[PDB]
């Protein structure tokens, strides 16, 4: 059941079509329903009307901050499954705050958040899959890549942000973990976003510049970053899992790379894949 959503943020039109320019987002109605998506960030503003009751922020590893008072996590949750700005429109969102509101998190608090989401995901109703979003990063830490790797090993499609350093992702975490689906950011004229990290360790590219999404205070905001490209991927996967069935956590990153539009991007250096997300739309 393919429907279409007219006047959709360019990023959604870019993923349901092989050629750029479309403002219509075409997708199957199931829209990642029966699937669960964990947003590991500054938290998610559940009350927001764009989530249609499908978001609940359930855990925090930050002292006395049990709410997204930053904006990052809610912006990312909107791209994953908000009514107007999200990919997987029937998905269920769960927020785990691992970054305080000034936008900072200890690696320890982050590793704990990843495990919490894995352990918690099994107490939730996600018959068609559990996906995860980590639009965060810092210097390379094996401890983090390992906690990240473990999520993958438990069957959770974890996608993480390449980074906004215009550098090779190999030097950051969760970015450098071979096992997670690392995401680079894309421009609407099909160029790698000037800030997007790159390298062999990045597994896919998706809309990352000028992305409109949900924001704290009941609004929307338009920001650019690899954290904007990542929820395009986490959402794309929930959608593919609710439509084609969950194939595995790494296999879902693999499936995404197979569907991806090839050699259409510019700004992509040698050693870096030239893959742009595509949702498999028959009439795409």
């Amino acid at each position: 059941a393919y429907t279409q959503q007219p006047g959709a943020p360019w990023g959604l039109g870019r993923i349901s079509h092989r050629s750029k320019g479309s403002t219509t987002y075409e997708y199957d109605t199931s829209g990642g329903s029966g699937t669960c998506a964990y947003v590991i960030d500054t938290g998610v503003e559940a009350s927001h009307p764009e989530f249609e009751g499908r978001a609940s922020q359930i855990k925090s590893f930050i002292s006395g901050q049990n709410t997204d008072g930053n904006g990052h996590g809610t912006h990312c949750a909107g791209t994953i499954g908000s009514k107007t700005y999200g990919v997987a429109k029937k998905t269920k969102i769960y927020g785990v705050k691992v970054l305080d509101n000034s936008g900072s998190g200890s690696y320890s608090g982050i590793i704990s958040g990843m495990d919490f989401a894995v352990q918690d995901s099994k107490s939730r109703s996600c018959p068609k899959g559990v996906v995860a979003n980590m639009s965060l990063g810092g210097g390379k830490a094996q401890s983090v890549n390992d906690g990240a790797a473990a999520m993958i090993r438990a069957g959770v499609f974890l996608a993480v942000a390449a980074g906004n350093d215009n550098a090779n992702a190999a030097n950051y975490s969760p970015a450098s973990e071979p096992t997670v689906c690392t995401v680079g950011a894309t421009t609407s004229s099909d160029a790698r976003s000037s800030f997007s990290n790159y390298g062999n360790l990045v597994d896919i590219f998706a809309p990352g510049s000028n992305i409109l999404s949900t924001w704290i205070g009941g609004t929307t905001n338009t920001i650019s970053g690899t954290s904007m490209a990542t929820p395009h991927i986490v959402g794309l996967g929930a959608y593919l899992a609710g439509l084609e069935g969950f194939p595995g956590a790494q296999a879902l990153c693999k499936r995404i790379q197979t569907l991806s539009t090839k050699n259409v991007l510019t700004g992509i250096p040698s050693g870096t894949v030239n893959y742009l997300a595509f949702n498999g739309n028959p009439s795409g």
Binding site: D41, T42, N70, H72, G73, L99, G103, S104, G105, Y107, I110, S135, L136, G137, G138, V144, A161, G163, N164, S173, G225, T226, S227
Partner: peptide, 4 residues
């Protein structure tokens, strides 16, 4: 880490 910081959000990106």
């Amino acid at each position: 880490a910081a959000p990106v």
